[PDB]
């Protein structure tokens, strides 16, 4: 609550994660263009660029609401003030201002991570699984995005415990570990699931994205979510949160009764297992049996542990962030 030194190290660790993630994408995008993979190149740059542009819209709106100029209040600008405030706390209500600026940053980097990392990890797993061995530069992007998702999920988890007192039971090292391994395991099962579908027909998978994007868009509209003061700006948040629910659940508005999450993951469990049965009962000549059965074990076992970690989460635990995504 007092923005301890460990929290400052969380902020310091973030700036390396942010800069390395940005520079790796630029290096990877240049590598693709040098290697002739234009399609993989523009997509790699599009996800980081479109992810950054969306986050900048929230960042500029939040600064303007509480208040050239468009880029003067970007994500990088927020980092510099947070580092200054964190250093002042170490040298020494300043803590309340410091933690408030930190939680505002956690929201933005969660969107930045899940609007870029999730669409890119599918792309990189598509490129790594197709050519077999990949290269060193592709490994850095996969690892940093895996760290960016891992780091952002923990930092966002810490922000909830400190901002609103409702998450009082969340204190402890274990809950930030079970939830972290929750997100990796349930995503890795879904990341590999989409990639398998992404090999047979790319067009159909993107059509399924739109159907799952609209459902997420509709559900938040049904849930009457309100996060942004501006009417026009809020639909951007409604549209974005729908995209995130395509990959992982986030319990919009945090006022649900655990029913939508169960209905979401019931579709996930039968949907993921339903895909494999089609690929198992009906063999596919495209796929290779030698490498497929490692994947089939990987996708099921990760989902098997992913659900178990989710069950552990509820069996033990369950001013501005009260409207952001909460719960699991």
């Amino acid at each position, epitope marked *: 609550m007092k923005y301890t030194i460990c929290n400052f190290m969380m902020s310091v660790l973030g700036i390396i994660i942010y800069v390395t993630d940005l520079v790796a994408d630029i290096v990877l995008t240049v590598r693709y263009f040098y290697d002739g993979q234009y399609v993989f190149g523009v997509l790699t740059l599009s996800f980081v660029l479109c992810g950054t542009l969306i986050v900048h819209c929230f960042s500029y709106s939040w600064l303007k609401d509480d208040l050239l100029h468009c880029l003067q209040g970007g994500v990088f600008t927020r980092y510099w003030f947070v580092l200054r405030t964190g250093y002042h706390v170490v040298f020494k209500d300043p803590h309340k201002e410091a933690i408030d600026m930190a939680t505002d940053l956690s929201m933005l980097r969660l969107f930045e991570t899940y609007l870029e990392g999730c669409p890119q990890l599918i792309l990189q797993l598509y490129a790594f699984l197709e050519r077999g061995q990949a290269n060193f530069s592709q490994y850095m992007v996969i690892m940093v995005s895996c760290c960016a998702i891992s780091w952002s999920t923990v930092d966002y988890q810490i922000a909830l415990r400190k901002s609103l007192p409702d998450k009082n039971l969340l204190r402890g090292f274990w809950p930030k570990l079970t939830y972290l391994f929750y997100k990796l395991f349930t995503l890795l099962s879904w990341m590999l699931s989409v990639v398998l579908l992404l090999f047979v027909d790319v067009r159909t998978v993107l059509l399924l994205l739109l159907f799952l994007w609209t459902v997420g868009f509709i559900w938040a509209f049904i849930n009457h979510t309100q996060f942004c003061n501006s009417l026009s700006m809020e639909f951007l948040y409604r549209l974005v949160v729908g995209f995130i629910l395509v990959f992982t659940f986030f319990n919009i508005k945090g006022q649900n009764t655990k029913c939508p999450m169960s209905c979401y993951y019931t579709v996930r469990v039968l949907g993921t297992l339903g895909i494999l049965t089609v690929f198992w009962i009906y063999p596919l000549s495209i*796929f290779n049996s030698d490498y497929f059965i490692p*994947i089939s074990a990987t996708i099921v076992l990760s989902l098997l542990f992913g659900i178990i970690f989710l069950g552990v989460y509820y069996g033990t635990y369950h001013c501005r962030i009260r409207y952001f995504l909460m719960d699991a």
Partner: nanobody
Amino acid sequence: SQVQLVESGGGSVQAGGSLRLSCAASGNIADIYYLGWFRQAPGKEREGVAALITYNGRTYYADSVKGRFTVSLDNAKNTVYLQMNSLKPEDTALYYCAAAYNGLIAAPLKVTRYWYWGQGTQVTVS
């Protein structure tokens, strides 16, 4: 790049004749699964002429040249040889030899399937 490809045998052959092209892999190919050939001429994209598996030897072909070419691999020199018979003018193209590591996708004809390629040789048919 510990592994490199050396290609030779390209040239100009009268239509209806025969031509043999050699492609040698320098380095290690212990885990190399696929390796085949492609042809490049202006005005169209790469297409898989033929391919084979280092382990088994199943010679996957293309419908355009099925039952016409003979591709084989000899493990003594780690070299792959492709033979052409009854050449036609449309066969004139830049022929690239490439190899691919093993992976989930089993399709030894996709251009993007293969990992590293070679310089290639020119083949002319009159």
